[PDB]
């Protein structure tokens, strides 16, 4: 029996007494804090596993950003870093980590669009910072006959983060709906690795969101 529901709330309004999105975010933050504590105090010169999180992820992400947009990466290092180590962590917490919305007794609409607004801030402030009038370049200029949609492209840039927020709200919510459907019919996950496919899709989506933020920054650069 399908019992799925939408957990849409208002970020501007105060938190609800249940606050499912806030509860999951707090759980993900607690898990990340525990992981960081297990690798900060118990850290060695060549730690295995404890320093592997910093090396194979944080250092790898920094190297990838430098290969994509070096120097600019240093300016927006935390911007993608905060995008990373989160959402995915929430997806893992949201990938039926125990109750899995069953016998309890990123999908959040506003949370995603708030992150999109934060990404817009990357273009609002750091964006074209090196030019200032860079937002007005190739937009209804003297060559505007060849750049008439250049403003529309900025409008696309105005919709690129929100659509990314849609990617954050979507897929994550879809995965939960698929899990609920598998619970309602054909129990014990599915013939395909439904839990594994959902986890892989969530990780790939978080990585794609980070790469999309980096690529939006690079496109804003030139």
């Amino acid at each position: 029996h399908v019992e799925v529901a939408a957990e849409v709330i208002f970020d501007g309004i105060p938190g609800f007494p249940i606050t499912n999105s806030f509860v999951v975010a707090i759980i993900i933050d607690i898990f990340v804090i525990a992981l960081a504590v297990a690798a900060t105090r118990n850290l060695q010169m060549v730690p295995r596993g404890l320093q592997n999180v910093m090396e194979f992820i944080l250092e790898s992400l920094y190297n990838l950003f430098r290969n994509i947009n070096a120097k600019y990466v240093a300016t927006a290092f935390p911007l993608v870093a905060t995008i990373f180590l989160f959402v995915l962590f929430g997806n893992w917490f949201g990938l039926l980590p125990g109750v899995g919305s069953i016998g309890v007794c990123a999908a959040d609409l506003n949370f995603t669009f708030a992150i999109a607004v934060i990404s817009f801030v990357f273009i609002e402030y750091w964006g074209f910072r090196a030019l200032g009038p860079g937002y007005l370049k190739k937009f209804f200029n003297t060559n505007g006959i060849m750049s008439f949609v250049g403003i529309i492209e900025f409008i696309s840039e105005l919709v690129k983060p929100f659509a990314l927020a849609f990617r954050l709200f979507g897929n994550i919510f879809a995965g939960e709906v698929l899990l609920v459907v598998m619970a309602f019919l054909v129990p014990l996950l599915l013939p395909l690795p439904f839990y594994g496919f959902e986890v892989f899709v969530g990780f790939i989506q978080a990585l794609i969101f980070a790469l999309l933020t980096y690529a939006f920054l690079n496109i804003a650069v030139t």
Binding site: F22, A36, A39, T40, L58, A81, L85, F111
Partner: peptide, 25 residues
């Protein structure tokens, strides 16, 4: 809530960034 976790992760990474830089040298 996102900003506080972001700052905590930034401090944790800055410590890991310092450790990685020390290891590189």
């Amino acid at each position: 809530n996102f900003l506080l976790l972001i700052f905590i992760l930034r401090a944790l990474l800055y410590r890991p960034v310092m450790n990685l830089l020390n290891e590189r040298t």
